[PDB]
Amino acid sequence: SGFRKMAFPSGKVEGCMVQVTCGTTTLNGLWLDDVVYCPRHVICTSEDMLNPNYEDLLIRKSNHNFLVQAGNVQLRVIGHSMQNCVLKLKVDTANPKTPKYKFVRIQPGQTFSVLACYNGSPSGVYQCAMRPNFTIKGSFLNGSCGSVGFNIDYDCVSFCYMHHMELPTGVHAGTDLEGNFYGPFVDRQTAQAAGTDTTITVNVLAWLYAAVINGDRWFLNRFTTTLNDFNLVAMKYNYEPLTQDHVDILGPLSAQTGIAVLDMCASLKELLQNGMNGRTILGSALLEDEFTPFDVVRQCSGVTF
Amino acid sequence: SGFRKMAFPSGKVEGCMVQVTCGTTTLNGLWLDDVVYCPRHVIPNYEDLLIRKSNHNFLVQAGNVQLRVIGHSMQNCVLKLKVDTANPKTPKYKFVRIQPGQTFSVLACYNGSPSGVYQCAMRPNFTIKGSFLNGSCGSVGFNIDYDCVSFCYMHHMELPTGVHAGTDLEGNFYGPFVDRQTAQAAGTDTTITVNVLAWLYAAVINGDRWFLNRFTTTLNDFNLVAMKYNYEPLTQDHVDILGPLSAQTGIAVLDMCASLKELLQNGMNGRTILGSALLEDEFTPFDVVRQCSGVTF
Numbered sequence: 001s002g003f004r005k006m007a008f009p010s011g012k013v014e015g016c017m018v019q020v021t022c023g024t025t026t027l028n029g030l031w032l033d034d035v036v037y038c039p040r041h042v043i044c045t046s047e048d049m050l051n052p053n054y055e056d057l058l059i060r061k062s063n064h065n066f067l068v069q070a071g072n073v074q075l076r077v078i079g080h081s082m083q084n085c086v087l088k089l090k091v092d093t094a095n096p097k098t099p100k101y102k103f104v105r106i107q108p109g110q111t112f113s114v115l116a117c118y119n120g121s122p123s124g125v126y127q128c129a130m131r132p133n134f135t136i137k138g139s140f141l142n143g144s145c146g147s148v149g150f151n152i153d154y155d156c157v158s159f160c161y162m163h164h165m166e167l168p169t170g171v172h173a174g175t176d177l178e179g180n181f182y183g184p185f186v187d188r189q190t191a192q193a194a195g196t197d198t199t200i201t202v203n204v205l206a207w208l209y210a211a212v213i214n215g216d217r218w219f220l221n222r223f224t225t226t227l228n229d230f231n232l233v234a235m236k237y238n239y240e241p242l243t244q245d246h247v248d249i250l251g252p253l254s255a256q257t258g259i260a261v262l263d264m265c266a267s268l269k270e271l272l273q274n275g276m277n278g279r280t281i282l283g284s285a286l287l288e289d290e291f292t293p294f295d296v297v298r299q300c301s302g303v304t305f
Numbered sequence: 306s307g308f309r310k311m312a313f314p315s316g317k318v319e320g321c322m323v324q325v326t327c328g329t330t331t332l333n334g335l336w337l338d339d340v341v342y343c344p345r346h347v348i349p350n351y352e353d354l355l356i357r358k359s360n361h362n363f364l365v366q367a368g369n370v371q372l373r374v375i376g377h378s379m380q381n382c383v384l385k386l387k388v389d390t391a392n393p394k395t396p397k398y399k400f401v402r403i404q405p406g407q408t409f410s411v412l413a414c415y416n417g418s419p420s421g422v423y424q425c426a427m428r429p430n431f432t433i434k435g436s437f438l439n440g441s442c443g444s445v446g447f448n449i450d451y452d453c454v455s456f457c458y459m460h461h462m463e464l465p466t467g468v469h470a471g472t473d474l475e476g477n478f479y480g481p482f483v484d485r486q487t488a489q490a491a492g493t494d495t496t497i498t499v500n501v502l503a504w505l506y507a508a509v510i511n512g513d514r515w516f517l518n519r520f521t522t523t524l525n526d527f528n529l530v531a532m533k534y535n536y537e538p539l540t541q542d543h544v545d546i547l548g549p550l551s552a553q554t555g556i557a558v559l560d561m562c563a564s565l566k567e568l569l570q571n572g573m574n575g576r577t578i579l580g581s582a583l584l585e586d587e588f589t590p591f592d593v594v595r596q597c598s599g600v601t602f
C-alpha cells in the first residue's frame with residue numbers, strides 16, 4: 001500500500017557524472033565508455049549566448065582547452081566533436097563504471113528520474129515528466145547544466161534528457177542524448193517562452209486507476225461517455241486530447257479494476273466539474289498527471305483492494 | 306528555480322542491498338563490512354525460534370553471489386548475520402535514530418534488488434507514509450552528510466491504514482509497535498508545523514508571495530490556533546532553526562506564523578503554493594536550505 005512519486009535508484013548514473021570546464025564555465029558531463037557528453041554551450045561566454053556561432057567557437061578550441069574531472073582524477077581529452085546541441089569529448093580512459101545503456105528520445109507525457117548535479121557531484125534525485133509543451137518542471141540552480149534524465153527498466157539505463165536551460169517562467173528545457181532539443185527551443189539567450197501547458201490526461205486516468213487499486217472509489221459515477229464528448233469537455237479544462245492509443249494503453253488497468261476506460265473518463269469529467277469537495281485522492285487535493293500507465297503498473301500491487 | 310520532493314542519491318546504499326531467505330520467507334538485508342542486518346521476523350518467542358536455527362539455514366544473496374553465513378545474533382528487532390566476506394562497497398556510515406518531523410530517503414527493495422527511491426518523513430505518530438508491497442521488508446531509510454551515509458530506518462511492517470512501521474538500525478521500533486501479527490494501529494497524526502513554515506519560506510524564495518500579510522503573532526497565540534487544526538506545537542527551538550530562512554526572505558518566523566494562521570482559518574481560496582493545494586509538511590528547514598543552495602555528495 002501507499003503511492004509515492006518514486007524515482008529509479010541513481011547509482012548507475014552517479015558513476016557516470018563528471019565536471020567539464022572550458023575557460024570560465026563549469027558544468028556537468030556524462031562519461032560513458034571513452035566519451036563525455038555535455039551541453040555545447042560550455043564553449044560560450046554569457047555575451048556569446050545572444051547569437052552564438054558554435055561551429056566558429058568550437059573550431060578555435062583544442063582538446064587541452066577542455067578540463068574534465070572524474071572525482072579527484074583529471075581525464076585527458078583526446079578528441080572533440082559536436083552533434084546537434086551536445087558536445088562529445090573523446091577521453092583517454094573508458095569509464096569502468098559504465099552501465100548497460102541506450103539513448104532514447106521520449107514523447108510528452110513520459111516520466112523519468114533526474115539526477116541533479118553541480119560540479120560533477122550528484123546532489124539529489126527526483127521524478128518528473130516531459131510536459132505537453134516540451135518543458136520539464138525541474139528543480140535546478142546555476143551549475144546544474146548537463147544533469148541527466150533517465151529510466152532504468154530491467155538493469156539497462158535509458159538516458160532520455162540532458163539539462164540545458166531555465167526559461168523565464170522557472171521551467172526547464174533540454175535535449176535528448178543526441179543533442180536534439182525537446183520543444184521549439186534553442187541554446188541561445190533569445191525571446192523564448194514556454195507554450196501554454198496542458199494536463200496529461202492519460203496520466204491522470206492512470207493515477208485514478210491507481211487510487212482504485214489502492215482501495216478508493218468515492219469519485220466513480222454510474223455514467224459513461226463517448227471519446228469525442230470526453231475530449232470536448234477535457235479541452236475546456238486545458239487537458240490534452242485522449243486518443244485511441246491512450247485508451248488501448250489503459251486496457252490492462254481497466255481489466256485489473258473492472259472499470260472501462262470510458263467509465264473512468266466519465267468519472268474524470270465529473271471531478272473537473274465538481275472539484276474534490278474537501279476530499280483527497282492518494283493524499284493529493286489536485287489531479288496528478290506525472291504517473292504514466294506503466295509507472296502505475298510498476299509501483300502498484302497486482303491485486304486490487 | 307523549481308521545488309521537488311528530492312531524495313539523496315542512492316548509489317552508496319544500492320551497493321549494500323542483499324536478499325535474505327530463511328525457509329519460506331524472503332526479504333532484504335543491509336550488508337555492511339562482514340555483517341548483514343535484516344528484520345528478525347525473517348525467522349513469537351524470537352530467542353526460542355532463533356536457537357533452533359543454524360548458520361546454513363540463512364541463505365544470503367548479493368547479486369549473483371551466495372554469501373556464507375558464519376554467525377548470527379539478535380539486537381532488539383534486528384537480526385545480524387555474520388558473513389564470510391566483507392562488503393567491498395561498504396561506504397562510510399553511522400547508525401542514527403531520527404526524531405518525528407525529520408525526513409530521509411528510502412530505497413525500496415524486493416529480492417535484494419533496489420526498485421525505487423523516494424523521500425519521506427517520520428510522522429509525529431512514528432509511522433511513515435511509504436510505498437511498499439510484500440517483499441519490501443528490510444528496505445532502508447537514510448540521509449547523507451558529506452560522504453557518510455546515516456542509516457536511520459529499516460522497514461518491518463504495514464499497518465491496517467496502509468502506513469508503515471519500522472526500526473532504527475539497532476532494532477528499536479519507532480512508535481509503540483511490535484513485530485508480530487496482532488491488533489496494531491497508527492495513532493491520530495498531526496501536521497509538522499516547523500516543516501510547513503520551511504515550505505512557506507521555500508515558496509517565497511521561488512516567488513510565491515500571495516499568502517504574505519502585514520501581521521504578526523505571539524508564539525502562544527499561534528500555538529493556541531495550531532492545536533485546534535491538529536498541528537504540532539511550535540517551540541522556540543523551531544523558531545531558532547527557521548532563523549536563516551527568515552533573514553534571507555525578510556519575513557520573521559512569527560510574521561510567517563500569521564500567514565499560516567490565515568491559511569488555516571480561511572484556506573487557499575482556489576490558489577496553490579508550489580503547485581500544491583494542501584500545506585506540505587515533508588520538507589525540513591535544512592531540506593529547504595539544501596535544495597535552494599545545491600549541496601552535493
Ligand SMILES: CCNS(=O)(=O)N1Cc2ccc(Cl)cc2[C@H](C(=O)Nc2cncc3ccccc23)C1
Pocket residue numbers: 041049140141142143144145164165166167172186187188189306
Ligand atoms: C535564468 C537563466 N538564465 S541565465 O542564468 O542568464 N543563463 C542563460 C542561458 C541561456 C541559454 C542557455 Cl542554453 C543556458 C543558459 C544558462 C541557464 O539557463 N542556466 C541554468 C539552468 N538551469 C537552471 C538555472 C537556474 C538559475 C540560473 C541558471 C540556470 C545561463
Ligand SMILES: CCNS(=O)(=O)N1Cc2ccc(Cl)cc2[C@H](C(=O)Nc2cncc3ccccc23)C1
Pocket residue numbers: 001346437438439440441442461462463464469483484485486487
Ligand atoms: C498487511 C500486513 N499483513 S501480512 O501481510 O500478513 N503481514 C503481517 C506482518 C506482521 C508483523 C510484521 Cl513485523 C510484518 C508483517 C508483514 C508485513 O507487514 N509486510 C508488509 C510490509 N510492507 C508492505 C506490505 C504490503 C502488503 C502486504 C504486506 C506488507 C506481513
Ligand SMILES: [Cl-]
Pocket residue numbers: 105106107110
Ligand atoms: Cl516515450
